[PDB]
Amino acid sequence: PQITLWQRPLVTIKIGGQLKEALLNTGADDTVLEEMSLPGRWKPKMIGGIGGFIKVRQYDQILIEICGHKAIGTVLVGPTPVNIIGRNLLTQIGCTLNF
Amino acid sequence: PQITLWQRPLVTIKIGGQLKEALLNTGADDTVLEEMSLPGRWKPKMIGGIGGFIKVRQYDQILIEICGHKAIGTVLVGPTPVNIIGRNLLTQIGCTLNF
Numbered sequence: 454p455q456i457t458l459w460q461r462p463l464v465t466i467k468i469g470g471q472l473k474e475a476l477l478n479t480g481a482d483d484t485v486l487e488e489m490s491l492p493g494r495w496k497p498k499m500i501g502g503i504g505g506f507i508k509v510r511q512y513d514q515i516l517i518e519i520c521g522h523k524a525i526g527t528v529l530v531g532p533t534p535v536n537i538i539g540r541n542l543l544t545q546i547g548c549t550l551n552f
Numbered sequence: 553p554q555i556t557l558w559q560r561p562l563v564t565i566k567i568g569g570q571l572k573e574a575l576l577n578t579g580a581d582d583t584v585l586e587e588m589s590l591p592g593r594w595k596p597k598m599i600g601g602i603g604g605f606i607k608v609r610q611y612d613q614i615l616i617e618i619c620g621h622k623a624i625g626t627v628l629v630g631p632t633p634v635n636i637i638g639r640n641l642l643t644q645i646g647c648t649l650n651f
C-alpha cells in the first residue's frame with residue numbers, strides 16, 4: 454500500500470507467534486521491539502538514540518510478518534518506548550519513500 | 553523522487569541560510585536539528601527518544617528547504633546525534649511510504 458504521514462505509520466506485525474503494532478521507521482537502521490518473549494539464543498548489544506543508550510538483546514534470522522509481508526532478519530529486543538521497524542526489514546518488504 | 557532504503561535516506565536541506573544534510577525520518581513526529589544558529593525567539597522543550605530525553609529549543613514558522621521542496625514549520629534544535637526531518641515537515645513536501 455501507499456502510506457501517508459499525517460499520522461504515525463503504524464502497522465500490524467506478527468513475530469514469535471505474537472501480534473504487535475510497530476512504527477515503520479526510516480530513521481532507524483535496525484529493528485527494535487519492546488521486551489517480548491522470543492525463543493532463540495541472543496547476543497548483548499548497545500544501541501544509541503536521541504537521549505542516550507539502551508541495552509538490547511540481538512536475535513538473528515528472526516521471521517517477522519510486517520503488514521502481511523514476511524521478512525527474516527535481525528531483531529533487537531529491549532527498553533525502546535515504541536516498537537520500531539528499521540531499514541534492515543523495510544528493504545525486504547520493498548518499502549520506499551518513493552513516488 | 554523515489555528513495556529506497558538500502559542506505560540512510562539523507563537529503564540536503566537549507567535552513568537559516570545554511571546548508572545541511574538530514575535524515576528523512578518517518579519514525580519522528582517532530583524535526584530535530586543539531587545545534588545551529590537560528591534567527592529569533594524560541595521556547596524550551598523536552599523530547600524523548602530511545603535512550604532518554606534531551607532539551608531542545610523550539611522554533612516555530614521556520615522556512616526550510618528539503619531536497620528542493622520548501623516547507624514552513626516547527627524545528628527543534630538541540631543535542632540530537634543526527635539531523636532528522638520528521639512527519640511535521642514530511643507531510644508538507646508530500647512524502648509517502650510505499651510497499
Ligand SMILES: COc1ccc(S(=O)(=O)N(CC(C)C)C[C@@H](O)[C@H](Cc2ccccc2)NC(=O)O[C@H]2CCO[C@H]3OCC[C@H]32)cc1
Nearest residue numbers: 480481483500501502503535579580581582600601602634
Ligand atoms: C542501532 O539501531 C538503531 C539506532 C537508533 C535508533 S533510534 O530509535 O533511536 N532513532 C535513530 C535516530 C535518532 C538517528 C530512530 C528515530 O526514528 C527515533 C525512533 C523512535 C524512538 C522512540 C520513540 C519513537 C520513535 N525517533 C526519535 O527518537 O524521535 C524523537 C524525536 C522526533 O520527535 C519525536 O518523535 C517521536 C520521539 C521523538 C533505532 C535503531
